[PDB]
Amino acid sequence: EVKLILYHWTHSFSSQKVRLVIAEKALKCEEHDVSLPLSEHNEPWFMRLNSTGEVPVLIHGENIICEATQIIDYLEQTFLDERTPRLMPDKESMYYPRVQHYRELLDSLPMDAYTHGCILHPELTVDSMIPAYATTRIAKQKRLKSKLLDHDNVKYLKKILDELEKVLDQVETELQRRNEETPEEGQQPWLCGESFTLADVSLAVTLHRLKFLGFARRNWGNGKRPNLETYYEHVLKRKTFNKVLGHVNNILIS
Amino acid sequence: EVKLILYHWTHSFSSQKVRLVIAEKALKCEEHDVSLPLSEHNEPWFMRLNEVPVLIHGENIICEATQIIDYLEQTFLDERTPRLMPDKESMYYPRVQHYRELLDSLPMDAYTHGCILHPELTVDSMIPAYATTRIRSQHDNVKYLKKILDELEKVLDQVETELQRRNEEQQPWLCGESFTLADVSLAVTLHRLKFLGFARRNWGNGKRPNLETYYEHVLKRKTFNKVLGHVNNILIS
């Protein structure tokens, strides 16, 4: 009866998680991309990534919910019709702690800082999908001030990239357990078991954004984290992921 | 042609502050009250007071009252548009910001629950008595409420003296001659206190007479009356 209304920036990381959850739950939503093809400074979305989409908002009848995690929690709790896929196991399920654990672990990642780091310090990326010209966009004194900021911001970026690796280690091990427990003839499982969950939305969208930023090759591929690599390949083939997010890394598409 | 869009609950304290700023700044806004006259439990708005408005303006999405209001002040700088804050370097800025922050720190949520839970502490509450009997069958139903009311007295103490300076020095407002964001915070605060039955305990009959005079001036202001004239009326959904 009451309409679902979503205001969002299509390319923002948060909007991607929200819109994928909506698609995975088969919900009808009136979605408003408020982002402009070209800004006041005639920039396209991939030159404005630090400007950032930030905060989507859902309106559902009399409820107003801002921010990705809060919106996703509202959706999972509100749409309980039996036709509606659930992205979370029942709170009494023996699988619930595992799913909740990886959901919070992935949602704790500082994605905004990775993106800012990508643009400010592209020498730490490999095959970033953002053009190099987005990066380009008393004298000893201020010189020294900015030298120090640069030193400080690189130590921060390096610290959180190491933390990302430790998180992706736990994920790789978890996916090894799924690999071990699944026959090569069976349908491939997701992160926490056979059903696609909220932890999968977070992991999937995180990996796709790491790819975009150029922090994929340091973290999987070429023999590194092969289960994670296979997972990402599985993600890209998922019909829902492709329908919702198939073009979001494509800078040719406004 | 950027549209200004507001989703809000009319009777929500935070929405009232936002909508009054919009009118004081003469901004055109597409306002959507999402509240329903009756809940699933057939409660009316005055039973559901325990919200988060959101502005959409072109590409910007702003949640919560204070952020929406700061966004409005920073963005609509056309010279025709009244300003509600003086200037970040002006010497009047720190005074306004201080009272804005002081008022905005009040736990309105606690007072409204307390009004309903412990109506013996109210005088002429506008909430029907049967709300007590329903809420009291089933956040903090404790005597601590009197301490939050005493703390309120101290904030209203501070306001009364600030008003005392203004008249000694057209009627002034709290912080000088022009209507500011601190007046917004104060006017909506007083009006809600009136609604809850905590006006007579805090002003009137010789108590805090500058505050009484201030509240009466607020009620006559065209913008306030046009936007908030009915919000204390339980006959109106």
Residue numbers in the entry:
A (entry chain A): 23 to 159, 186 to 302
B (entry chain B): 23 to 72, 76 to 163, 199 to 229, 235 to 302
Manuscript text:
The ganglioside-induced differentiation-associated protein 1 (GDAP1) is an integral MOM protein, proposed to have an auxiliary role in mitochondrial fission and fusion, possibly via redox-dependent interactions with cytoskeletal components. GDAP1 has two GST-like domains, followed by a transmembrane helix, which anchors the protein into the MOM. Structural data have shown a covalently bound dimer interface in GDAP1, and while dimerisation is a common feature in catalytic GSTs, the GDAP1 dimer is formed differently, with a unique interface having a central disulphide bridge between Cys88 from each subunit. We carried out structural and biophysical analyses on several CMT-linked GDAP1 protein variants and describe new crystal structures of the autosomal recessive R120Q and the autosomal dominant A247V and R282H GDAP1 variants.
All these interactions are lost upon the mutation, and the His residue in the mutant is observed in a double conformation, making no side-chain hydrogen bond contacts. Arg282, studied here in the form of the CMT mutation R282H, is one of the most conserved residues in the GDAP1/GDAP1L1 subfamily. Its strong hydrogen bonding to the carbonyl groups in the ⍺6-⍺7 loop indicates a central role in GDAP1 structure. Arg282 is, in addition, optimally stacked against the aromatic side chain of Trp238, which is both a conserved residue and a CMT mutation target itself. This Arg-Trp-(⍺6-⍺7) unit is likely important for the stable folding of GDAP1. This is another example of an Arg–loop backbone interaction in GDAP1 that is both conserved and relevant for human disease mutations. Ab initio modelling, here carried out on the R282H mutant, which was measured at the highest concentration, supported the presence of a dimeric GDAP1, corresponding to the conformation of the dimer we previously showed to fit the solution SAXS data for wild-type GDAP1.
